[PDB]
Amino acid sequence: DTKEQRILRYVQQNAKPGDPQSVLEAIDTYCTQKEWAMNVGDAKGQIMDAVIREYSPSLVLELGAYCGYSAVRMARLLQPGARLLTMEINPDCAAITQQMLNFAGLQDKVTILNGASQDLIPQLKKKYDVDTLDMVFLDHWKDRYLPDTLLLEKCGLLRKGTVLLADNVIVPGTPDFLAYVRGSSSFECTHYSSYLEYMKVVDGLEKAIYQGP
């Protein structure tokens, strides 16, 4: 019995099938009352919700699925026919995320890709039929944020206006990524100060909009 299985079982027993809002509320209750987990959370999730409503992305890429919290969160706001691709290196988590999405009834909007982002990003054009991305949510491992941003650019997956949204730019913190996008004339950056999920600890999200070569 892992924490991630306990979160899924809690949702299965305390949320309504096909209601993504009740799924998000059950995860937030479990993680506030029972066991902390590294879901984006309601505080930062509200900022994500606002950004998704602004840009109404047709194709979103998420790096780091975990239990599926942010996937449900973004997927429930996507337009009919819009898609999310989420990459998850840990197969146990991949499987928890698939079941989470199935229960929320969002499985037809989301494809979970198994593997390291650094292995799958180069496969997106040919293996997964991707042209360019409208939005990327970076929330996997801090040390991958900058190399994966640079890899997405190299692979031609970024276009003018592509919205990169990065979780945890303050805690655990992504200093090289932040220094890079903020100093780069290829990105327009905005910081959204907030709180670490379920904690009274300052964190934030960085929005960096790609401006071209």
Ligand SMILES: Nc1ncnc2c1ncn2[C@@H]1O[C@H](CSCC[C@H](N)C(=O)O)[C@@H](O)[C@H]1O
């Ligand atoms: N290189 C990599 N590629 C893909 N996934 C990775 C990765 N390094 C870490 N991960 C995964 O990223 C996750 C971090 S937690 C992700 C939280 C999720 N976005 C949410 O808010 O609900 C973990 O599940 C971990 O397995």
Ligand SMILES: O=c1[nH]cnc2c(O)cc(-c3ccc(F)cc3)cc12
């Ligand atoms: O490693 C992480 N990947 C993605 N998101 C995370 C996230 O939101 C929080 C944390 C985290 C924060 C504080 C702490 F004390 C221990 C872990 C890690 C990740």
Ligand SMILES: [Mg+2]
């Ligand atoms: Mg995070």
